[PDB]
Amino acid sequence: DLPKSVDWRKKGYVTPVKNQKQCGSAWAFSATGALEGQMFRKTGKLVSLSEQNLVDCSRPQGNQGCNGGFMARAFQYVKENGGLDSEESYPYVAVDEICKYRPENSVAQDTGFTVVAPGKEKALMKAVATVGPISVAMDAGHSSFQFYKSGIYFEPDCSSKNLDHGVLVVGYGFEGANSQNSKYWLVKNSWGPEWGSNGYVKIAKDKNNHCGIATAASYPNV
């Protein structure tokens, strides 16, 4: 009984597209994006969250800052730390720096996170429909993705198991009148608004877990 389409951007859950620049911090942007949606669902206030706070401070939890990391380890950091600072108060500079977490500037918290049944696009569809934006890993390691500009993205060389890039599923939809025709996942990237379609990409949906979008999906518990 899930909706034919979902787009959380239309309900105020999603901040404008950000840019990680030359830092392997996509996992931090995916995590802040999912926490931004859950915090909005809880309080009605959309507050941009600090990726730099995660880059600089979550090494104990197993992240490696600009050398990579994982969204579940970032949600683990926010839980163990008791908070996460706003983007305004702890700005992004795209380089590993000293941890400067300030509890008085915290605007978010989580108690851990929930994992979507791995490899199941229908499970991911249910989480997107009932929770809000969901953090996901994908295989983005292709020039077709770097130069992606519009339309549904399908890449034959995509893997659903060996992934390399965290992104945020903000909804799903279809092209035209038939809800089961030309389906896609609405994905927010962190390569800036100029990349792709206003910083977003439509990834083919119900095409065998294309690019691994439902392989490692999760969301923070607020």
Numbering used by the authors: 1 to 222
Copy out sentences from the published article reporting this entry, exactly as the authors wrote them.
The pattern II group (binding shifted to the non-primed side) consisted of structures of nine protected peptides and one non-protected peptide that all bound uncleaved into the non-primed sites. Electron density maps of the peptides enabled the unambiguous interpretation of residues from P3–P1. The nitrogen of the amide protection group at the peptide C-terminus was bound approximately 3 Å away from the ND of catalytic H164. The amide likely shared a hydrogen bond with the deprotonated His residue. At P4 and beyond, the features of the electron density maps became weaker and less precise; however, it was possible to model the peptides KPKKKTK, RLSAKP, GNYKEAKK, and EVCKKKK up to P8 in the averaged kick Fo-Fc omit maps. MPD molecules were bound to the primed sites of all structures.
Addressing the elusive specificity of cysteine cathepsins, which in contrast to caspases and trypsin-like proteases lack strict specificity determining P1 pocket, calls for innovative approaches. Hence, we set out to determine the crystal structures of cathepsin complexes with representative peptides of cleaved substrates. As a working model, cathepsin V was chosen because of the resolution of diffracting crystals (up to 1.3 Å) and crystal packing with accessible active site cleft. Reactive site mutants C25A and C25S of cathepsin V were used in structural studies.
